[PDB]
Design a protein around this ligand. Structure first.
Ligand code: HEM
Length: 184
């Protein structure tokens, strides 16, 4: 049904300080539900300390011209490249406008990271049950193409980059200040 992908392997020895810093843009995404066809842009600022991830998330619905802001918090797994977060909703000023709903969570796996690129996978859940998943290619630069290591990781799990939505070809609007000021 809304089952999350299997064979999502956490990167071995992810450099935490490097990955959990700055702002990441999704340059390419693949929603595993083929009927999910609203076009989006996304960026986020993940941070980690003492085995807990605290990240700020930014989505922009290109179809509707509406953005939404969330923050997520959760424990990093012992592998160091996978975490499950509970999330709330905040405004552009970072003030909570909707509390976290305990029944919802998401699990991020960092599959690969190389140079200025990364590949992540996100499984959304409700009551610990899968409700949908998506792969995202990340880059520090909105307009950049992914490192070959990222394509190799995609190919290991039988995905090809051409199937992904390219965000640079979308009319994205980003709130970069929300992310750059994260935890300042
Ligand atoms: C370009 C890449 C992405 C796309 C296309 C995408 C797509 C979506 C869509 C369509 C929804 C539902 C929106 C709605 O209900 O109106 C959603 C919700 C959500 N996404 Fe993503 N997503 C992306 C990246 C991410 C990433 C990387 C994360 C986590 C690090 C994430 C976390 C969430 C969360 C927590 C929600 C639920 C928000 C809420 O209901 O308050 N998304 N996403």
């Amino acid at each position: 049904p809304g089952e999350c992908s299997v064979n999502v392997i956490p990167k071995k020895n992810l450099d935490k300080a490097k990955f959990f810093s700055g702002t990441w843009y999704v340059t390419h995404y693949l929603d595993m539900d083929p009927q999910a066809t609203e076009k989006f842009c996304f960026s986020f600022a993940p941070r980690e300390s003492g085995g807990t991830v605290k990240e700020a998330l930014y989505h922009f619905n290109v179809d509707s011209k509406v953005s939404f802001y969330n923050t997520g918090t959760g424990p990093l797994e012992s592998n160091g490249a996978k975490y499950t977060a509970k999330f709330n909703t905040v405004d552009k000023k970072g003030k909570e406008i909707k509390p976290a709903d305990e029944k919802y969570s998401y699990t991020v796996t960092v599959i690969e990271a190389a140079k200025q690129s990364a590949l992540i996978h996100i499984c959304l859940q409700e009551d610990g049950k899968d409700i949908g998943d998506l792969y995202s290619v990340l880059n520090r630069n909105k307009n950049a193409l992914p490192n070959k290591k990222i394509k190799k990781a995609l190919n290991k799990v039988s995905l090809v980059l051409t199937k992904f939505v390219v965000t640079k070809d979308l009319d994205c609007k980003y709130d970069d200040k929300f992310l750059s000021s994260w935890q300042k």
